[PDB]
Amino acid sequence: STIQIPYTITVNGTSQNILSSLTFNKNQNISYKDIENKVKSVLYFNRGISDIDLRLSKQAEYTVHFKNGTKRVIDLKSGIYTADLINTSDIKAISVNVD
Ligand code: NA
Ligand code: NA
Incomplete structure (x- = not known):
């Protein structure tokens, strides 16, 4: 009853094509706040980017394709x-981009 949604994170750049994905419920309506929470989780665990790091970044966004x-x-x-x-x-x- 779940699906994977691929994601990528750009902080300082990698030379890799990372095949990472997030687990979502299949065919479910969700909010952009829900997605933001999942983005914050992978930012912290994958890249060490905390909420305070986002507060102190000049620009940060995610894009739903x-x-x-x-x-x-x-x-x-x-x-x-x-x-x-x-x-x-x-x-x-x-995709996620943090400066
Ligand atoms: Na990257
Ligand atoms: Na804005």
């Missing part, structure tokens, strides 16, 4: 106010 070719960029240092939910099975991949 949809299967239809469109994207939504979420600013990790700003509030999330949309009520829109998105379906996990419509998501192709998630």
Whole structure:
């Protein structure tokens, strides 16, 4: 009843094509706040980037890449106010960039 959604994290750059993914429930509507929590978890455990490191970064975002070719960029240092939910099975991949 779960699926993997691939993700990548850019902090200072790697020379690798890392095949990492996050576990989500299949075909479930979720919020951008839910995704933000999962992004924060992998930032900490994979890269040692804590919430305080995000507070002290000049810019940070994650981007949801949809299967239809469109994207939504979420600013990790700003509030999330949309009520829109998105379906996990419509998501192709998630990218994260922290400065
Ligand atoms: Na990278
Ligand atoms: Na913003």
